[PDB]
Design a protein around this nucleic acid. Sequence first.
DNA 1: GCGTCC
DNA 2: CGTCGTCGTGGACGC
DNA 3: ACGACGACG
Length: 283
Amino acid sequence: MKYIGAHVSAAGGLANAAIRAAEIDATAFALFTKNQRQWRAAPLTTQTIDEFKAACEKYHYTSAQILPADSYLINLGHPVTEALEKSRDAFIDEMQRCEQLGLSLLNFHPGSHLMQISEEDCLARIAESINIALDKTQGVTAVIENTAGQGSNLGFKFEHLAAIIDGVEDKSRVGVCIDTCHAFAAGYDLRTPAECEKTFADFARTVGFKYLRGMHLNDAKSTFGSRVDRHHSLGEGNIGHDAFRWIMQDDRFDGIPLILETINPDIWAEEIAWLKAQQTEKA
DNA sequence: GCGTCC
DNA sequence: CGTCGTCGTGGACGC
DNA sequence: ACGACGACG
Ligand SMILES: [Zn+2]
Ligand SMILES: [Zn+2]
Ligand SMILES: [Zn+2]
């Protein structure tokens, strides 16, 4: 089985994310549990928690089908002591909110060295940031997303993801999410079935499918190897529809949230219907 | 400085 | 009753 | 982008 959805808006309350996901016939969803551009939010209450849990129950969304994401502000490998501590406190709060909402996964980007520290030192800071959050919370897996590798951002090579995992004590609560736009912008080709196969064969050797906890299904406005993070609607960008058909027909992507972060929410329901249809169409 | 990032 | 214009919030990054 | 708020007339 495959679970397919989009990163829906949580405007007006978290329960609305489950309602919006049901409106596009999604079998999975992603959301921010608090505002993506702010350091802190009001603590979750019994009401908000119950309303969210009741809507997920009503629309058949178990924790295995939901992939929350953290804010844009957090930098888990920050080279500055004070900014690293602030990012770690916010990340702990993000994980605690997940635990309270009955969620079991949390998607986040590794972090950036800001040209101040080496890539090894940055990756080690990231692994320790994960260790601190896993030591403070329970039942939530830290899902590291790969990146396009803009600026000083890390996570653009599968080796970066494997190096962070190696530094994580509790391997049962660390995982990865592969974003197709990010992989393509980073130089992992997906334009042909042969390319997709090669990209995922390298992923299996370097990281391993035992850690894959989710996917982000995005076409790319940016070009191959551009190191530019610019998504596009499926079939409208530089990757094309073929890679998405290929993913849908490959059983290694079963049982995990497959999330659209495409730029045109007006067509999310068509993207979901097309993705579902690929499981019973020709290769 | 604005838009994207998700 | 709504919905425009605008601001606060505040982080890196492409362009 | 989300929530908030003044001003509509
Ligand atoms: Zn993504
Ligand atoms: Zn992206
Ligand atoms: Zn299958």
